[PDB]
Design a protein around this nucleic acid. Structure first.
Lengths: 358, 913, 363
DNA sequence: CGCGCCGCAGACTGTCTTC
DNA sequence: GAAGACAGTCTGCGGCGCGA
């Protein structure tokens, strides 16, 4: 119950006036998210794209309009991918097993008057040859499962189930065991040539594709995951007397934070500016925690830094001006030591590589 | 009235005798090789009464006016001249403010130098801004010192508020202050930075140096080097180099004055100046004493050389220049510098872009066939859940066979192997804390940048080395002039100069960017833009040091007048301020003033980043720069000088008729109306006519003609020879400068070699260096130039005296000349701008009448008697309707045009309503 | 003139084949390809780096897609105004403060009643009245410099000053497209008119501490567009007469080019190079470099055409792995800006690319 | 007018470093 | 022992501004 309040206080979530209940956050009726939440969502989307899009060789992204052009807020991105597949077959040089994925905002209805809420979801439509089409979907059933262990503190929370229907012979559904309850965060559906016939009125020549030097109709496997809901579930799994969220460093909005205390004001400001510039140039996100004249307490500042998904806390004191050593504290280890100013960038790079490298 | 123009001459009632022989001579001279019969459209006759003339005639009237204006300052100068003074004190004080010493060096905390004569030299710490750093003054009684207050810890307050040194009491008489260039000390005063007029007037002993015992800069170079071209070499012993030590040596044979060895003020820091405080103050007092002694030796000599009170009254004026400004000055400075940097980096980026495109040539071996950019080295150096099959460990299995040559060797010259040598040299060395990609060490000064973005016609001997420099750049071993090029370059012996024979180097080749057969490659997109970028940034690259850090003092709310307050545009957070130009009066050998930044052309043209400097010189709210450009001041002065010397008529010589009959619009004006028609080009033939008249020679005119456009030596000589036909045809004696005439250079030469009397209008001597009695200059251009220059200076003095008299007898506010290059702006407040325009017109009428009276003839034409248009604007621009480049437009600023006026005297009563 | 064939071949544009200039500029296009999305993401990241994190007292802010006070949002300024109170509260009442946002906004477009989406970047700056003009000048200045960089020919980019109907000065930024000058950004300085319109109940709480005394804040809204900025970058990058050397190249900046590096395999036919290329692929992604899997495609028999297409997508570097990589490792490297052949060891290549990108970003 | 710092540009260069 | 790097070294040609 207090997790939402903590997230809102630390800029992890937006105001709770419109989305006080978890139902609004789960659906698209939530009143936005804080800058920390926006950063976390962007990092999660980038990591998912790198693992699914950039990591994959035959997979290239796609873009679908937020509104439906028609022939009304958009409900899914599969239609755009299916429409663009006609050109992508020739452009990709008969990429029979290739697919198109996109992470974007889609509108869903919530219901006196039923409203429309926008939520961020990642939809991937993959064309596969029929002879192993379902098997290709099974391959995703592994790869998506890998994402379940990509950043989740407890991989056992994620679960998978098999479902069938008239439209799709084989389908996979992924669920996350949130503290409130189990919620479906990923779904899979393997549609055949019926969708191609509906979109293409007898376009067998265009629908047929080159696979293994053979003309084969591509079956479309659509995998839809909840980017916002998935991020919320991962954040909840990260949390576990002290309320500290051990968020994944890769998806953490801020990696390191700069502070000023116990030293010259000009020297501390110069050191903080240099550290921020180095982090920006090196691609390391640095929280601009300096320029604070309050100085309430060290414990309060440490708690605020830990609650803000900060991988580590950096404090600059007279030791930095004396021998270049500043206080470095790791939230996960609950330990503090002295680290060199020059070695801070190397340590951050090593930590990022270790977190990214499984 | 209506005779040949003219008017009902209110001055000099009676007489007005024409002269039968005189008028016949004038008519027969104008008819022959001229056009005396013209439509002569009359102007609407002006029916107004002039202000009463106190004197019997104009000359006596202005003599009395200038005497009334200059008597207190003259008696103050004489009072300090013969005052008895003790020697310097043994030691100086250390308190703030002013101190006096006097009896046995008894320090007393005086708050004000309450006496009407001072020298008051000042020294500043150049490294620590433009703030004052202490000062030594010698009032006639008991010496004086001032403390800058910047020697005390803390108190780092910028914006120049209470930073300058007080020199005037609250007035709850008048003052005079001397100095070498006391314009430099007119700042650091805190009372001269006031919008209201200042009762104190200043005298530069360098102004007197150039007035009496001065040197032309062409002669100053000879003086400092020796400290047809062979001179008599006597004039060096009677003039000095405009330096305080040198002028002290010249004017009195005492122990030599010594420059500071360390030069702590020029090159030093505040603390080091504290360390050498007593020695620096001693040297400053030595400088003040030398200034006082040379002033004592000069003032009687100056007065006997420039005795007419009007010239000294007007020299006291023009040391009271005042350029008001606001926060828009800082905004323009920041915007111009930012645009300069932005365009510099844009041009650098363009250069790297064409470098990349050139490197792309060799992929298809297309650089060899390139008619340009082929002379470089251009050479290439030959240097289900299954994991991966072998993971990334194969990377660790590759490694190297130790061909990396460690880490130092590959980096500086070997980095990026196989690239062309020019690219490799241009690339920053990999062993650098700050590496930048591409050929980022590519500037304008290199030999590669001209090859691309400055191609033009691919100058056939512009292969550099040996003489290098510009070569043919036009048409008329092999490939002396060939479009295909691929020149052998065996030796610079091609058909043509093949070197820099002329060798002209004075900020040139920028005017040739506009057309002039000097262009970039149209094929590229960023090539011509880079040339355009250089064209726009050139002038700011030249003048950003001067234009920035101008010693601008921002007046606070209290220092501004009540005319600014209780105004529609009053208050507001914009910092009002002012700039005293630090204009050195009589900066040239002629009494023309000099200021390298404010008294310059500064056309404010488009396609120039630094332009609009004179623009947005904004009168404060409630004030307008009511000013006029004297309609062809130098040309009219030469014309009337020729008119009175020959037949006493304004239409005697064709120069006089052309000056006033011609008009800019559909008329035969001398500049851009007749010079272009008889000459070539436009707006440059105007400069040619301004140069040939006003002091120059035929070789100078020819050289300027080659500077204007491309022409051969023989063709230029032929053009000059044809030009002398119908021109003055100078250096022809036994005529009574003879020949076709149509331009009287006889008056200038005749008055030049006329011993101590040297100026017609106000009787002012030139110098003891170029005068005829001691020596005879080999080339007489300096003195003939001086005649017109000092006549123009006396014109300006006459306007200043007349305007001061009109502003005193009639309550006209503002009273602040902004005189620049023959134009005068006066900043004359609102609800007086039409009254001030009438005052300007009456002042021009009286000044031209005085010129005529003292120079030979009585009548004055109406075509010249009045200003064509008295510009009443809120900023200083060449025209009321003008625009600038770096901003969107002046209308984006607060400038809203104005009213040129002219014949629009709706406020006919010069007196207040 | 008609360079949209390049966008047709390489998916930098939407799915529709017929893309007139009006169709692209109207903001009602069907969408973009992967390259366009990557380019726009690069633009947003560059803007965030240049504006928010580098300059203090600037924090990103979020706005909902609908305004309950249910219609699609037209401007991002309202969302910043709603969150202004909390954003000023978390800071120590510093009147000079900034807010930033980037998001998709739907607008009504009338063509002869459609709704078109456009990506808007909003910067809302609260300043004292005395510093309003100088801060506005700084904002339009460094925004103009930001536009000039990432542009081969930044003369086409420009700014203009103008006066609003209410008497408030402002500035509008433009790009000179070949068909005509088109707006990209606008700047409006307001005397907290909209802030008081949203919160007219009390004025004391809306004040900020400029020092010992408190004054009413003055707002400045800088609103720019990125999809049109994307098309402007694509048009500027493409370049025609008298060169005697025509090569279709899209010189997109290294900072925002969609694909940075390309991988490939030579003829061989020794095989086994796919594993080396896969390892190099992983080494490239683990540091943040986007790679084109160019080694899957085969039966081309022409490297020149492959390099031409890779240029058309603005791929900064092309890396080719041949049989001489397993021993005496030397991958072939070709640079987009300069078609130069280089031989480089497998190690230090990733760091070379990282240094190249960082140095291009710096200058 | 013009002249000596001044300031980069371009070429030289004796000596350090590597294979 | 032979070749490349390098941090100095000399010359040149724009240019500025002087001199309290």
């Amino acid at each position: 119950e207090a997790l939402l309040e903590i997230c809102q206080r630390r800029h992890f979530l937006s105001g709770s006036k419109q989305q006080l209940s978890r139902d609004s956050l789960l659906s698209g009726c939530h009143p936005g998210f804080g800058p920390l939440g926006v950063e976390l969502r962007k990092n999660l989307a980038a990591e998912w794209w790198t693992s699914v899009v950039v990591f994959r060789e035959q997979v290239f992204p796609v873009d679908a309009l937020h509104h439906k052009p028609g022939p009304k807020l958009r409900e899914n991105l599969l239609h755009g991918a299916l429409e663009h597949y006609v050109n992508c077959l020739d452009l990709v040089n008969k990429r029979l097993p290739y697919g198109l994925a996109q992470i974007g905002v889609c509108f869903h209805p919530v219901f006196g008057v039923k409203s429309i809420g926008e939520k961020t979801e990642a939809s991937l439509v993959w064309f596969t040859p029929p002879r192993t089409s379902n098997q290709w979907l099974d391959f995703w059933l592994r790869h998506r499962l890998q994402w379940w262990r990509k950043f989740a503190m407890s991989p056992s929370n994620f679960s998978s189930s098999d479902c069938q229907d008239e439209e799709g012979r084989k389908g996979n559904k992924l669920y996350y065991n949130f503290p409130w309850g189990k919620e479906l965060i990923e779904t899979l559906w393997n549609l055949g040539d019926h969708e191609l016939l509906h979109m293409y009125p007898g376009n067998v020549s265009k629908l047929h594709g080159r696979d293994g030097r053979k003309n084969v109709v591509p079956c479309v496997l659509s995998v839809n995951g909840d980017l916002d809901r998935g991020m919320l579930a991962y954040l909840y799994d990260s949390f576990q007397h002290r309320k500290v969220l051990k968020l994944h460093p890769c998806l953490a909005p801020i990696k390191v934070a700069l502070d000023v205390g116990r030293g010259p004001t000009l020297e501390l400001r110069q050191v903080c500016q240099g550290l921020f510039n180095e982090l920006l140039e090196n691609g390391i996100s640095v929280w601009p925690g300096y320029l604070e004249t309050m100085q309430s307490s060290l414990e309060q500042l440490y708690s605020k830094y830990d609650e803000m998904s900060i991988l580590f806390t950096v404090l600059v004191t007279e030791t930095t001006l004396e021998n270049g050593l500043i206080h470095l504290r790791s939230r996960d280890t609950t330990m503090k030591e002295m680290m060199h100013i020059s070695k801070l960038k190397d340590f951050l790079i090593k930590y990022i590589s270790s977190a990214k490298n499984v | 009235m209506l005779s040949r123009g003219l008017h009902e001459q209110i001055f000099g009632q009676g007489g007005e005798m024409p002269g039968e022989a005189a008028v016949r001579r004038s008519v027969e001279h104008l008819q022959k090789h001229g056009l005396w019969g013209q439509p002569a459209v009359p102007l609407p006759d002006v029916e107004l009464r002039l202000p009463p003339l106190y004197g019997d005639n104009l000359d006596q009237h202005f003599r009395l006016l200038a005497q009334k204006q200059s008597l207190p300052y003259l008696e103050a100068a004489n009072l300090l001249l013969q005052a008895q003074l003790p020697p310097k004190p043994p030691a100086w004080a250390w308190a703030e403010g002013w101190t006096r010493y006097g009896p046995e060096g008894e320090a007393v905390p005086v708050a004000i130098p309450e006496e009407r004569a001072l020298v008051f030299d000042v020294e500043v710490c150049l490294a620590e801004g433009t703030c004052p750093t202490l000062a030594v003054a010698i009032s006639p009684s008991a010496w004086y010192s001032w403390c800058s207050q910047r020697l005390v810890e803390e108190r780092y307050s910028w914006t120049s508020q209470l930073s300058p040194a007080d020199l005037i009491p609250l007035e709850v008489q008048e003052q005079l202050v001397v100095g070498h260039n006391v314009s430099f000390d007119r700042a650091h005063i805190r009372e001269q930075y006031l919008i209201q007029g200042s009762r104190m007037r200043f005298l530069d002993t360098m102004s007197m140096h150039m007035a009496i015992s001065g040197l032309s800069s062409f002669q100053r170079s000879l003086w400092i080097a020796a400290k047809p071209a062979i001179s008599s070499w006597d004039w060096l012993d009677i003039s000095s180099v405009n330096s305080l030590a040198e002028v002290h040596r010249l004017y009195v044979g005492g122990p030599p004055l010594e420059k500071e060895p360390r030069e702590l003020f020029v090159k030093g820091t505040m603390k080091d100046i504290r360390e050498n405080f007593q020695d620096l103050m001693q040297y400053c007092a030595q400088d003040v004493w030398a200034t006082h002694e040379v002033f004592q030796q000069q003032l009687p000599l100056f007065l006997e050389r420039c005795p007419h009170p009007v010239t000294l009254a007007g020299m006291l004026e023009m040391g009271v220049s005042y350029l008001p400004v606001n926060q828009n000055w800082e905004r323009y400075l920041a915007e111009a510098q930012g645009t300069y940097e932005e365009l510099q980096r844009e041009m650098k980026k363009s250069l790297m872009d064409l470098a990349n495109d050139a490197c792309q040539l060799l992929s298809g071996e297309r650089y060899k066939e390139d008619p340009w950019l082929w002379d470089l080295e251009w050479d290439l150096q030959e240097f289900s859940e299954e994991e991966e099959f072998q993971q990334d460990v194969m990377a660790r299995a590759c490694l190297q066979k130790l061909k990396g040559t460690t880490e130092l060797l590959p980096k500086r010259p070997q980095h990026l192997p196989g690239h062309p040598g020019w690219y490799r040299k241009l690339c920053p060395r990999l062993d650098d804390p700050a590496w930048t990609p591409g050929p980022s060490l590519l500037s304008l000064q290199m030999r590669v940048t001209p090859k691309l973005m400055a191609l033009t016609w691919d100058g056939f001997p512009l292969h550099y080395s040996e003489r290098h420099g510009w070569g043919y750049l036009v048409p008329g071993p092999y490939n002396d002039v060939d479009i295909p090029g691929c020149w052998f370059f065996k030796l610079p012996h091609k058909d043509g100069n093949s070197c820099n024979v002329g060798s002209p180097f004075a900020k040139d080749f920028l005017p040739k960017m506009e057309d002039g057969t000097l262009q970039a490659g149209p094929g590229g997109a960023s090539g011509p833009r880079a040339l355009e970028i250089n064209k726009m940034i050139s002038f700011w690259r030249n003048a950003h040091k001067r234009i920035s850090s101008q010693m601008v003092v921002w007046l606070p709310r209290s220092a501004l007048p009540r005319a600014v307050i209780r105004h529609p545009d009053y208050d507001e957070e914009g910092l009002y301020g002012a700039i005293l130009p630090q204009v050195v009066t009589a900066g040239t050998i002629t009494r023309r003033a000099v200021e390298p930044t404010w008294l310059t052309a500064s056309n404010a043209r488009p396609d120039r980043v630094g332009s609009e400097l004179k623009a947005m010189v904004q009168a404060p709210p409630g004030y307008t720069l009511v000013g006029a450009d004297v309609d062809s001041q130098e040309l009219w002065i030469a014309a009337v000088l020729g008119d009175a010397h020959f037949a006493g008529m304004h239409g005697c010589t064709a120069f006089g008729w052309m000056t006033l009959q011609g008009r800019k619009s559909r008329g035969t004006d001398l500049h851009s109306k007749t010079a272009t028609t008889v000459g070539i080009s436009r707006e440059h033939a105007k400069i040619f006519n301004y140069g040939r008249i006003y002091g120059a020679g035929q070789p100078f005119a020819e050289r300027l003609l080659m500077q204007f456009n491309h022409r051969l030596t023989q063709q230029e000589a032929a053009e000059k020879a044809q030009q002398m036909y119908a021109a003055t045809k100078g250096l022809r004696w036994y005529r009574l400068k003879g020949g076709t005439e149509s331009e009287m250079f006889n008056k200038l030469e005749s008055i030049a070699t006329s011993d101590i009397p040297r100026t017609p209008v106000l009787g002012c001597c030139i110098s003891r260096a170029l005068e005829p009695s001691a020596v005879q200059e080999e080339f007489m251009t300096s003195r003939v130039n001086w005649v017109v220059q000092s006549s123009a200076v006396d014109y300006l003095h006459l306007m200043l005296v007349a305007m001061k008299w009109l502003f005193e007898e009639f309550a006209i506010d503002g009273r602040f000349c902004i005189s620049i290059h023959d134009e005068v702006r006066y900043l004359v407040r609102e609800e007086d701008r039409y009254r001030a325009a009438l005052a300007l017109q009456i002042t021009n009428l009286l000044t031209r009448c005085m010129f005529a009276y003292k120079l030979g003839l009585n009548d004055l034409p109406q075509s010249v008697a009045f200003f064509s248009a008295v510009d009443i604007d809120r900023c200083l621009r060449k025209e009321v309707t003008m625009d600038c480049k770096t901003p969107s437009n002046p209308t984006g600023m607060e400038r809203r045009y104005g009213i040129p006026q002219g014949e629009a005297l709706d406020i006919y009563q010069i007196i207040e309503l």
